[PDB]
């Protein structure tokens, strides 16, 4: 799972790596950033990655009832 | 005056009704002789909603409600001023004193309603904004 | 005229209310009120027109209309007249009852074929009809642009003969449809200049702005007439 | 012919089996009409119109306007044909019958050469006669407009 | 308080509709200019030399067809729109006998 | 349907064709076969091309009417379903319409007669000169299809044509002409359940006394599926029908309550009875008058005849397949013309039958 | 930004217990709105038969031991109730899902070409 | 719970109910029949009414919608007209472009970003080329530079053009759509002459252009340029002062500079609410920093703001446009490096070597050197980026497509809480949501 972060601050980018199984969950960070919202719902619908902590996780772009995540 | 000619005008424009109905009733192609698949009532699909293509399944703002509840007061005064336009000249400066009157009485209504704001749709449920205090320890 | 105006207006909302399409049953409610609130700015702009003649006869108001057409000292209340007509026929920019990107086809994304045509034409039977009022009441009908020009061509046909009845149809008809078309023309014209006006702003115009203007000519014309003994009268 | 007679039997079979709201409010429309057309032919032409620009352009619009606020939701045909046919055999509204047998006529004369209209007179005596009720009239709306918001507005 | 514009000229703009009428006129200048419409089919839009439209198999002057089977644009093609089978021909050219194209899964890309 | 419609990948016809099968069956398989149904654009046809279409069988789709053919192309692969322009009195179209295929379905009929065809030319005209064709374009397998009271002797005109032609069949094909006559068929948009959901039927009582056994469409569709896909089905008679007996009059009222339609159904015109000899003169009149075919003379008669069974015929389990009863699928063929939905599973369906039949 | 109807948070549970009783819990909300499924999709059965199918699907799963299998086959159980409620699946694929219909011998198989 | 639901003054006890002839107790076997008797208040707050939980009204603003310019499927939970909740269904695009991308080499991976964004279809495949460009340690010669930011603002115009006047369309100004539409007719056209496709032009690659200009195009480019000013004009007179289109926007849509960075949003929906970010500033990329251009800034962050600053990138576009035309270098369009670049005809035909790179670059495909990268560009909807992942072979391993729409439709919610349906109408035009890139 990779993050890219944007300081219009200070003119900077970024990136957060961390690692993630098919069964171990990983925090959201929808707390922090609401414009992660639907790139964990994303993540999940093509990964199938357990997102901790989302107020609302399903598929985004699959149809529903779609069986497999696919972009594994 | 007459008015015979008025009403062939009016029985011709009730004969004018049956015919548009009718000439579609008429000249549409039998549902065999198009496609055969069914007459509108067999086929559902066909004689259904529109819902841009998903299938789904009126608590109105009560501002809609008094702009037509408060139309009729208004169109009584207006429907009202009909008896002084035909009678101007002869009810001279009496008629047109009480005419004033009439409508002074009516306008103190239309400033109660226009400082009330009744007509407003407001937002009261959303749009809202705080500050953000520090509770400092 | 207002009164079969008004039957119509009873037409257009039931074509909803026997529905159970969202989006043809979304344009009853704000159809409902955007005909009912720009009714009584017509109603009332008529009237005035009605109360500087005081007859209620569609031919005496024209006739009235020889020495002066009464767009001149009634200018406001014909740009009242024309844009309370364009609500009253749903045209752009009062477009909010069938506006395509809003409620698709409102009303009439339930009707098709007949139903369809029916409707379609009746309104633009409303604005024939509503460009022909505004060649009434503030352009003089049927009178010609020129007295003289009229004179000269009615001169070339002989009175006993009846080419010079259909000579004078043809003229007195042939004023009214130039003044109807301009306005017919400005129908089309404002559709094509004017983007879409909201609905929730759209009520709140005829009631705040248009209607004290109206109220306050109807107090003001009658105290113009009689301050210089002009009260009129059917002749 | 009086068709006048089966456009009520028409109505009145309407009246008799109307279930929900859509209906009820039809009964008002179809009596209305015939009641602005027997205005317009035969007594007053003047009140036809100011019926349909009264009635139906004020107060028939707003019974359906609030019909799809309020909601929409939810015999035998021997009994009804048997109660219209009831109701249809006795319409002697009075018992006078030489009042409803022998007919009248007036004589008219040339001694009024100042001819205006009927809602000429009626602004004539409405405007100077008795302004007291055209000044209470707009009185009872004044308290009308008042009254709707007091009843309605939520705040 | 701060407004340049006094109370009448900003009620004169607003009750006269100062800018829809001159929004108005702006439209009526385009009724009395040339417009823009071709009548297809008699006449076309322009064309250059490197468009790209229906797909031709072309050969020499002197009539032998010009490819030799080579499936380099089978293995460009982006979509695999493209099947070629070769082999050689009776008399030993390198020539192909199954050429097709699948033109309703052709992205129309020019590789 | 299933995955597969055939027993065997390789199936030899009477005529030494060896066809061999490639695919698992779905829309990307073939059959080998190449099959011709006439009247495809039919009530029957169109259930019948689609099953064939579906697992990669092609299908050769004589037609008249242009548009109605075009739907039947969803149901076949690019190349499946094939569409050959046709009249009955052209012979060289149908020459072409049998030219390549190896199985031939007639359900070209009718019950009804026109002022360009008669019952006489359709019903025993039209199968006898495909048979002739068919036999002399070397097809191995042809299916008939006949009305549930196939009986030469009968007075009705559509029994007394439909009888003689299951003849004339195999007095031009042979001895090898299956032949399959089909109960009164249930189906979505079907000219029998259509009558029983009409409000203004006129001659309700006249009409509606008639009894007969329903089927389902699909069955029959799937039932021609196996007797064409099977080589020892060839020179037999099949009467298809269904167990349980209804009868019209049970129906229109059963399908009443599913409609729920006190005052208005006797005012809205659902029962129109009427005098006989009136019904055999209205309905002479609109033969023509009326540009439609509508309830005609000939109809009239079958109204007198129940449903005979011809117990010297085969049924359904001679196929492997129980037959489906109206109970359990006259519900989901009302909902078109049908707080909570009202669901009548085969319990609440049979319970209701009582409710009709109790005074 | 609020989340829609019928939603509910995802959080990893880490006692076996309490995923049961989550369990049980969400097996009555399919049951309760089993007629209002009927209803709203228009199915062609009963509603007993939609209580019938959906006690199934859970059993098939009741004999997982590991945790964190438990957890994600518990979130995607809710997805799936979330989506039936809000009447975001279309009528097509709730028939197909209820909709779903011996094997042959081995001469059967090898004769038909088999798999 | 799901299908029903269920004090200000003092609690009153009230015992010993009796009436004149008798207590309560003594005919309350008969008060079930007298509604005077009723001793339960149907005006106490405590009152037990079992009142179902009826959903609220929900439109589906399904994809068979003018409005919807792909295919939506909004849903819209309101209180009577003011919008609650609103679910945007996306997907009903989605084609699984990342998942066919992973087994492409990079030449064919390109035309798959024409289709992602239908009207910014240049500046699409430029941001592939930059990040397939930063993988392989390759830098553009100064030619083809130019031609990409002349043909990146060119497509900036055309995008724009789609954008801000069927904005307008929606907002029922039909004829202002139409004079911007012949522009694009004419603005097409430099595309069907450099590429030979009015629309999905693969031009832009990895290592540069396809091909190099036509002569004669910089004078049609300049030609066009002269007029295009006024042009622009003609629509700022219908919309930027009328009344009715001032109505339709100011105050609707407004967001925050603090809700832009949380939400992510970028592009002209983060300058509306007044931060002055730009990617073509931030990093400078194909000659973007050789040119002098300004940038418009908002203040109120409403609908009316993001339609000025779009009309002011109009003309900034139409002057970085002139200067390409003026500073036009002369030399190579690509590489000259025949490794990653195809060889002209020419020199294929006659050269050993030239026919042999001919020959793997279109079969076998050239390698990645293995590595990953994140390449943002100034895209006309606002930021859009790419994650490829290389692993040294001549296919990417990953590319996640970063769309400005998809960040921007998930702040939708957050932006149409408190607003009527035709005001959803103008937030998402204002948005500029192709629905390619936001269900890529
Ligand atoms: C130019 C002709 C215009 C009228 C066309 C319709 C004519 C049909 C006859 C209705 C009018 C008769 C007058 C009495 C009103 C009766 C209304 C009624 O009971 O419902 C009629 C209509 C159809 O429903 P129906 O099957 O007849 O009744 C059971 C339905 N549950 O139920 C419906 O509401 C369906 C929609 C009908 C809406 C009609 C609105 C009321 C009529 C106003 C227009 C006509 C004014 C009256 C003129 C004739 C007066 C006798
Ligand atoms: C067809 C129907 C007829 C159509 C034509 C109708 C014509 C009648 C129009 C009604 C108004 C006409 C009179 C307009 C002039 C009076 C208003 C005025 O003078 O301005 C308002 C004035 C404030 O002055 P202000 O303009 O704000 O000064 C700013 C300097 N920078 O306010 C003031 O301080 C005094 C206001 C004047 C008091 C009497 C009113
Ligand atoms: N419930 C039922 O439907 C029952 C029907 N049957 C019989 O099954 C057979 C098939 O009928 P079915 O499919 O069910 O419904 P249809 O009556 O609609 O089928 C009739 C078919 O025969 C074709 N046809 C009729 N006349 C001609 C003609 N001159 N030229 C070419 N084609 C013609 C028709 O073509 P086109 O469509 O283009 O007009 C149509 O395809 C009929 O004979 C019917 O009597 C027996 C038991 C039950
Ligand atoms: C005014 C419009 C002028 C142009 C359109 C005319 C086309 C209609 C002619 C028509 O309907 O002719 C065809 C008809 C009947 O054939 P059908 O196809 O079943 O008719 C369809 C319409 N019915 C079924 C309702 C009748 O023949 C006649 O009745 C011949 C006289
Ligand atoms: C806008 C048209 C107004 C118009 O025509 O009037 C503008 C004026 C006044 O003319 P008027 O009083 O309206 O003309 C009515 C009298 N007739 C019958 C002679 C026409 O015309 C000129 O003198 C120029
Ligand atoms: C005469 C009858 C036809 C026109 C009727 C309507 C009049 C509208 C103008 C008055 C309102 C107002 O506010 O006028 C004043 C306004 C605005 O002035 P400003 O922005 O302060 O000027 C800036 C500073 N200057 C004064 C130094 C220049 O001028 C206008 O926008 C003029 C619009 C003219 C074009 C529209 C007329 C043609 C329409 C179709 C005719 C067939
Ligand atoms: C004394 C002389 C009397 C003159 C009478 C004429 C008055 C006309 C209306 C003026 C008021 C106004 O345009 O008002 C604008 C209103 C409401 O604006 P608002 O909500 O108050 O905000 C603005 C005002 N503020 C900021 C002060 C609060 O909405 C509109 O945009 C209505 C535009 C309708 C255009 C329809 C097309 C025209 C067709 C006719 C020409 C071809
Ligand atoms: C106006 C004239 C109406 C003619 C309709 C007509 O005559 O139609 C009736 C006849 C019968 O033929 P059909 O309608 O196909 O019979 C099918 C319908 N059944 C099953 C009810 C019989 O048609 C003809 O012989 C048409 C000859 C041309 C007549 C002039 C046109
Ligand atoms: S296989 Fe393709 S690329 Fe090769 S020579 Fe033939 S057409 Fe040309
Ligand atoms: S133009 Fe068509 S056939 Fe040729 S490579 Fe591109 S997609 Fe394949």
Redesign the pocket.
């Known amino acids: 799972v990779v993050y890219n972060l944007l300081s219009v601050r200070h003119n900077s980018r970024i990136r957060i790596k961390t690692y993630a199984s098919e069964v171990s969950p990983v925090p959201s960070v929808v707390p922090l950033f609401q414009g992660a919202n639907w790139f964990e719902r994303e993540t999940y619908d093509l990964f199938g990655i357990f997102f901790e902590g989302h107020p609302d996780l399903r598929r985004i772009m699959t149809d529903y009832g779609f069986q497999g995540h696919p972009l594994r | 005056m007459l008015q015979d000619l008025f009403n062939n005008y009016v029985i011709l424009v009730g004969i004018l009704g049956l015919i548009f109905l009718g000439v579609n009733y008429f000249i549409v192609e039998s549902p065999?002789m198009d496609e055969?698949n069914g007459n509108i009532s067999d086929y559902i699909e066909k004689s259904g909603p529109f819902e841009c293509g998903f299938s789904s399944f009126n608590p109105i703002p009560i501002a809609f409600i008094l702009v037509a509840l408060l139309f009729l007061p208004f169109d009584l005064e207006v429907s009202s001023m009909l008896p002084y336009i035909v009678s101007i000249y002869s009810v001279g400066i009496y008629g047109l004193i009480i005419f004033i009157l009439f409508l002074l009485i009516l306008i103190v209504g239309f400033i109660y309603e226009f400082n009330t704001k009744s007509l407003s749709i407001t937002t009261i449920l959303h749009k809202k904004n705080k500050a953000l205090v520090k509770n400092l320890y | 005229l207002l009164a079969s105006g008004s039957i119509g207006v009873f037409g257009t909302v039931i074509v909803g209310w026997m529905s159970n399409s969202k989006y043809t049953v979304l344009a009853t409610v704000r159809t409902t009120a955007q005909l009912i609130s720009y009714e009584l700015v017509l109603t009332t702009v008529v009237f005035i027109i009605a109360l500087i003649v005081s007859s209620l006869n569609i031919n005496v108001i024209i006739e009235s209309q020889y020495n002066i057409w009464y767009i001149i000292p009634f200018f406001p209340l014909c740009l009242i007249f024309f844009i309370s007509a364009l609500a009253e026929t749903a045209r752009p920019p009062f477009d909010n009852v069938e506006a395509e990107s809003e409620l698709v086809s409102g009303h009439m994304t339930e009707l098709s074929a007949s139903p369809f045509v029916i409707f379609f034409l009746s309104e633009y039977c409303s604005m024939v009809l509503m460009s022909t009022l505004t060649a009434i009441f503030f352009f003089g009908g049927y009178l010609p642009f020129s007295n003289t020009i009229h004179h000269l061509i009615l001169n070339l046909f002989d009175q006993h003969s009846i080419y010079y009845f259909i000579i004078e149809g043809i003229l007195l008809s042939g004023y009214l449809a130039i003044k109807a078309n301009f306005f017919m023309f400005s129908f089309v014209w404002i559709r094509a200049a004017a983007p879409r006006l909201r609905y929730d702003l759209l009520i709140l115009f005829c009631w705040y702005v248009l209607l004290p203007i109206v109220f306050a000519i109807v107090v003001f014309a009658p105290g113009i007439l009689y301050c210089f003994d002009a009260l009129p009268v059917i002749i | 012919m009086n068709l006048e007679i089966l456009d009520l039997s028409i109505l009145g079979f309407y009246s008799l089996i109307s279930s929900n709201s859509f209906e009820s409010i039809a009964i008002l429309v179809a009596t209305i009409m015939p009641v602005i057309t027997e205005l317009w032919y035969n007594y007053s032409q003047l009140f036809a119109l100011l019926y349909t620009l009264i009635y139906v352009g004020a107060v028939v619009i707003l019974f359906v306007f609030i019909l799809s606020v309020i909601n929409e939701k939810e015999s035998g045909l021997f009994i009804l044909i048997l109660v219209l046919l009831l109701d249809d055999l006795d319409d002697n509204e009075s018992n006078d019958n030489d009042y409803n047998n022998v007919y009248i006529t007036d004589y008219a004369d040339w001694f009024n050469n100042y001819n205006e209209s009927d809602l000429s007179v009626i602004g004539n005596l409405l405007f100077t006669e008795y302004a007291l009720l055209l000044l209470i009239i707009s009185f009872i709306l004044l308290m009308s407009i008042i009254g709707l918001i007091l009843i309605v507005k939520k705040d | 308080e701060e407004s340049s514009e006094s109370a009448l000229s900003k009620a004169t703009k607003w009750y006269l509709l100062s800018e829809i009428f001159r929004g108005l006129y702006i439209t009526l200048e385009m009724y009395f200019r040339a417009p823009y419409t071709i009548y297809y089919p008699f006449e076309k839009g322009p064309v250059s030399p490197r468009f790209r439209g229906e797909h031709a198999l072309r050969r020499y002057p002197s009539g032998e067809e010009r490819c030799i089977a080579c499936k380099l644009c089978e293995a460009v093609c982006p979509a695999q729109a493209i099947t070629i089978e070769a082999e050689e021909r009776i008399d030993g050219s390198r020539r192909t006998y199954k050429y097709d194209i699948d033109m309703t899964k052709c992205i129309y890309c020019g590789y | 349907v299933s995955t597969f419609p055939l027993k065997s990948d390789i199936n030899i016809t009477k005529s030494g064709k060896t066809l061999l099968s490639v695919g698992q069956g779905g829309r990307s398989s073939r059959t080998g076969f190449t099959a011709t149904v006439?009247?495809?654009?039919?009530?029957?046809?169109?259930v019948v091309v689609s099953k064939l279409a579906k697992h990669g069988t092609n299908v050769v789709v004589?037609?008249?009417?242009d548009r109605?053919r075009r739907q039947l192309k969803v149901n076949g692969d690019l190349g499946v379903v094939n569409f050959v322009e046709?009249?009955?009195?052209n012979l060289k179209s149908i020459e072409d319409s049998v030219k390549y295929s190896d199985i031939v379905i007639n359900?070209?009929?009718?019950?009804h007669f026109?002022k360009?065809?008669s019952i006489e030319?359709?019903?025993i005209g039209?199968a006898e000169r495909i048979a002739k064709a068919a036999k002399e374009a070397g097809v191995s397998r042809l299916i008939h299809?006949?009305?549930?009271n196939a009986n030469p002797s009968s007075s009705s005109d559509?029994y007394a044509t439909?009888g003689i032609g299951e003849q004339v069949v195999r007095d031009n094909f042979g001895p090898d002409a299956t032949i399959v006559?089909?109960?009164?068929?249930?189906?979505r948009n079907?000219?029998?359940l259509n009558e029983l959901l009409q409000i203004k039927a006129l001659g309700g009582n006249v009409i509606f006394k008639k009894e007969v056994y329903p089927?389902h469409?699909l069955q029959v569709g799937e039932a021609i599926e196996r007797i064409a896909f099977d080589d020892a089905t060839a020179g037999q008679t099949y009467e298809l029908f269904g167990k349980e007996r209804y009868s019209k009059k049970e129906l229109r009222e059963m399908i009443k309550h599913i409609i729920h339609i006190g005052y208005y159904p006797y005012s809205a015109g659902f029962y129109l009875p009427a005098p006989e000899p009136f019904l055999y003169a209205f309905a002479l009149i609109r033969q023509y008058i009326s540009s439609q075919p509508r309830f005609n003379v000939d109809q009239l008669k079958r109204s007198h005849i129940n449903q005979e069974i011809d117990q010297s015929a085969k049924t359904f389990t001679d196929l492997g397949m129980v037959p489906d009863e109206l109970s359990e699928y006259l519900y989901r063929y009302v909902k078109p013309h049908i707080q909570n939905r009202t669901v009548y599973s085969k319990e609440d369906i049979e319970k209701l039958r009582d409710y009709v039949n109790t005074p | 930004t609020n989340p829609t109807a019928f939603a509910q948070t995802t959080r990893y549970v880490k006692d076996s217990t309490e995923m049961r009783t989550l369990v049980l819990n969400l097996y009555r909300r399919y049951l309760r709105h089993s007629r209002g499924f009927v209803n709203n999709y228009n199915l062609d059965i009963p509603a007993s038969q939609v209580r019938t199918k959906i006690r199934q699907e859970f059993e098939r799963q009741r004999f997982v031991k590991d945790l964190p299998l438990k957890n994600v086959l518990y979130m995607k159980a809710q997805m799936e109730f979330q989506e039936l409620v809000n009447f975001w699946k279309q009528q097509c694929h709730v028939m197909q899902y209820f909709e779903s219909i011996k094997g042959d011998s081995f001469v059967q198989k090898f004769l038909k070409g088999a798999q | 719970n799901d299908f029903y639901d269920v004090n200000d003054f003092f609690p009153v006890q009230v015992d010993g109910i009796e009436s004149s002839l008798g207590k309560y107790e003594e005919f309350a076997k008969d008060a079930h029949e007298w509604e005077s008797w009723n001793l339960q208040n149907e005006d106490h707050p405590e009152y037990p009414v079992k009142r179902t939980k009826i959903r609220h009204f929900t439109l589906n603003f399904g994809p068979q919608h003018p409005a919807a310019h792909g295919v939506l499927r909004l849903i819209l939970e309101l209180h009577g007209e003011e919008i609650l909740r609103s679910d945007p269904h996306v997907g009903l695009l989605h084609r699984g472009t990342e998942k066919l991308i992973e087994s492409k080499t990079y030449m064919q991976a390109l035309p798959y970003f024409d289709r992602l964004d239908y009207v910014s279809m240049m500046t699409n495949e430029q941001v592939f080329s930059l990040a397939v460009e930063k993988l392989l340690n390759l830098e553009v010669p100064e030619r083809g530079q130019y031609i990409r930011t002349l043909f990146g603002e060119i497509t900036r115009v055309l995008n724009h053009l789609m954008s801000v006047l069927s904005h307008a369309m929606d907002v029922g100004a039909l004829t202002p759509f139409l004079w911007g539409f012949e522009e694009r007719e004419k603005l097409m056209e430099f595309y069907e002459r450099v590429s030979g496709a009015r629309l999905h032009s693969a031009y832009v690659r990895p290592g540069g252009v396809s091909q190099d200009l036509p002569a004669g195009l910089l004078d049609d480019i300049y030609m066009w340029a002269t007029q295009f000013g006024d042009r622009l004009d003609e629509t700022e007179e219908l919309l930027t002062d009328s009344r009715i289109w001032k109505q339709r926007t100011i105050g609707i849509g407004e967001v925050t500079a603090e809700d832009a960075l949380n939400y992510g949003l970028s592009g002209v929906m983060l300058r509306g609410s007044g931060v002055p970010f730009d990617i073509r500033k931030s990093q400078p990329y194909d000659a973007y920093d050789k040119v002098d251009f300004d940038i418009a800034v908002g203040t109120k962050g409403d609908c009316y703001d993001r339609y000025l600053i779009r009309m002011t990138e109009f003309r900034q576009s139409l002057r970085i446009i002139e200067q390409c035309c003026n500073q036009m270098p002369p030399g190579p369009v690509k590489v000259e490096d025949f490794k990653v670049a195809p060889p002209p005809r020419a020199l294929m035909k006659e050269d050993m070597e030239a026919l042999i790179h001919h020959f793997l670059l279109y079969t076998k495909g050239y390698a990645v050197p293995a590595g990953e990268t994140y390449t943002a560009i100034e895209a006309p909807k606002g930021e859009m980026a790419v994650y490829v992942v290389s692993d040294g072979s001549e296919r990417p391993y990953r590319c996640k497509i970063r769309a400005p729409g998809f960040a921007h439709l998930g702040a939708f919610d957050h932006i149409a809480r408190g607003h009527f349906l035709p005001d959803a109408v103008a937030i998402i035009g204002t948005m500029d949501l192709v629905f390619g890139e936001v269900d890529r």
């Open positions: 065999r055969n | 006439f009247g495809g654009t039919g009530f029957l046809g169109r004589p037609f008249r009417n109605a046709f009249d009955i009195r359900l070209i009929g009718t019950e026109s360009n065809f030319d359709v019903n039209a299809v006949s009305s549930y559509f439909k006559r089909p109960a009164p068929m249930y189906f079907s000219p029998f089927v469409a």
